[PDB]
């Protein structure tokens, strides 16, 4: 029986960031725990938006999940049903 993960396709609302880390991961299109996960802190403080203190608690809050950054994860992302 093959083992998967259901964590990753939780959305990133379910973590439980401050607003404004939540409402910047968006911004990147980082919708869901699945894309969170696989970015990796150089290239999230790149982005605009996001500075030491997010990051700091983005690693804070997925640590205490099990989970970090730079996950390299299989057969992403999660699936749909396809459109006719
Ligand atoms: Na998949």
């Given at each position: 029986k093959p083992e998967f993960d259901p964590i990753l396709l939780r959305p990133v609302?379910?973590?439980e960031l401050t607003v404004r880390?939540?409402?910047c991961l968006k911004?990147?299109?980082?919708?869901?725990?699945?894309d969170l996960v696989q970015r990796t802190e150089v290239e999230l403080l790149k982005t605009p938006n996001l500075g030491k203190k997010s990051l700091?608690?983005?690693?804070?809050?997925?640590?205490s999940r099990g989970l970090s950054?730079?996950?390299?994860?299989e057969n992403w992302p999660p699936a749909?049903?396809?459109?006719?």
């Open positions: 609302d379910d973590l880390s939540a409402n911004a990147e299109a980082i919708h869901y725990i699945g700091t608690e983005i690693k804070d809050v997925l640590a950054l730079g996950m390299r994860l749909s049903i396809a459109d006719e």
